[PDB]
Symmetry: D2
Subunit: 171 residues, 4 copies
């Protein structure tokens, strides 16, 4: 095990991502955040808080539930959605903690597309660890973390582990 | 209305892309072309790779098009090999919003369970509307929304050329 | 000509750069800002103010005067009133084009001392690099043709904040 | 301590970089290669041989001798003009970027090139100056403490790249 981001690094990466989202969309008009799974939902909320602070207006947040990577043959499935607003003609930013193969994000993208025809779908992740297996990229990235295939990235968030931290495990 | 790649620039981009594919994809990989122009580039890429490595590369086809209330949809496929556990490289002429590549990716996923899907395009013109990127890119060409990129290939236009139009 | 950034877009880009600078360096300990030319100096000061607001300690600012005599740019003078040795120096300029101005500025900093790191922040990167130089922090990437020109107007000296493209 | 590129991976990377050099410059007109230090010179010769095979014209090759703890230029054996040329510097590894900046200064003392570009076999990160390669064989992430070692046939009698310490 080793620690690769601490609470401060995380706070700092999220704050920069928020500015980038506002910058790239010329304000938050028409933007919604949709979080993926538990940790993604927590990050999307954090991102929404910060953007409200910065711009003075709130950002809607939505949820998508997808099967687990960890706690094993797999192909991830959307269990459910909780998006209580329209997505058509909106700029939807998916949020997740780690981008690995990209297969989870693709399922989240499909779920949004079943709900509506958004203008744009964008992606924000806290960690991009490589090993992509689909042609998918994040628009906003907190840290690029190289890894070997056998390593694991674990993101601890305050809302459930009571410390904010990112670390690598050898497996 | 300007020419931005000529026959020689196109030849040089494809030859570099073929070497990149081999480097990254060191066995085999397969090529699946999208629409008429994407199928011609995949064939060209396959031919270059056999010349460089001495083995053939299988090539597959996806036919895509548009229908009314907008999104592109898959008409048919001709992939005469299994895609399961394979490294599939989608090929198209231009990456724009990314919606066409997403339909092609979806078609490959119906056929099988590949190990990997990668993307090679001759031109990436920006204005992505989905979170999609190309692994291999011939040229990044900035454009405004109102411009259009037109790729002409020997096989059907009898001149190899890439140009920008407005409208 | 056309307008590609306005006062609000510029403000948002500088605010974001300031947060990236802090993030990348894990706080501003040991960091100094050195602006290049008139417009680069103004941007370095703005960045310094923002960083202070964000982080509560000030950032020293320095200046380098580059003047023009392929007409190669030359360092006229410097006013860096602190040491640069073992510091992280962030050069600041208006527009990154061929990279030749930044290379002179880099050469000036290396005469003054031996820094730990030299980094670069620019408001606009317009391409056409002629030396192997890149910016660490970029406000906006703006594609251009060789013949076009990027003009940055800052409040301090033009009374309007904006960036625009001209031809010839 | 691992092998990160083998002889075949090196061969392929150089072949690809050569095609990228021709593409980016639309042929080799006005292009010269200047290698840095011993290993950079060997790579520049290899690149030049590869480009001649591909385009059927030779590419001149120059040498810059750099030493050490500021790296500084001990020698410059560039027997052609550089003014208005497209000069591609070549080295084995890009680390802090300080060696490449000394090579860039040495070329600028010789004349005014149209362009200076950079080709390296390995880019290992940890830049300390705002410098990047145009052409890169492999991006290899590393920690500050690790070391990249490049072995070439001409002087080590094996072609290989590895990570050390
Ligand atoms: O090292 C990893 C890899 C994957 N995941 C989880 O799986 C998804 C990413 O894997 P993939 O679908 O991109 O392969 C994310 O939701 C992430 O939470 C991790 O938490 N850590
Ligand atoms: O400027 C353009 C835009 C689109 N297309 C064609 O339409 C699709 C555009 O992709 P997208 O907007 O769905 O990414 C591709 O098949 C491509 O052949 C072009 O040829 N040029
Ligand atoms: O389109 C341009 C080109 C150059 N410059 C000015 O010249 C320098 C950048 O040119 P270069 O030396 O990077 O080519 C900067 O100081 C910038 O202020 C511009 O403002 N706009
Ligand atoms: O891991 C390393 C680091 C440096 N160097 C050598 O020293 C210079 C390092 O570059 P830099 O620290 O000057 O960027 C290059 O010539 C290279 O030959 C290596 O070979 N491997």
């Amino acid at each position: 095990k080793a620690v690769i981001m601490d609470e401060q690094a995380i706070r700092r990466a999220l704050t920069r991502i928020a500015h980038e989202i506002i910058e790239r969309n010329k304000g938050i008009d028409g933007c919604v955040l949709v979080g993926i799974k538990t940790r993604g939902i927590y990050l999307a909320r954090r991102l929404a808080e910060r953007i409200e602070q910065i711009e003075g207006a709130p950002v809607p947040v939505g949820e998508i539930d997808i099967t687990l990577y960890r706690d094993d043959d797999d192909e991830p499935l959307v269990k459910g959605t909780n998006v209580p607003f329209p997505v058509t003609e909106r700029n939807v930013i998916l949020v997740d903690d780690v981008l690995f193969t990209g297969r989870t994000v693709r399922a989240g993208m499909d779920a949004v597309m079943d709900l509506g025809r958004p203008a744009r779908i964008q992606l924000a992740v806290l960690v991009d660890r490589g090993h992509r297996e689909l042609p998918i990229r994040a628009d906003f990235v907190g840290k690029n973390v190289p890894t070997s295939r056998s390593e694991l990235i674990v993101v601890e968030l305050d809302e459930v582990d009571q410390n904010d931290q990112v670390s690598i495990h050898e497996n």
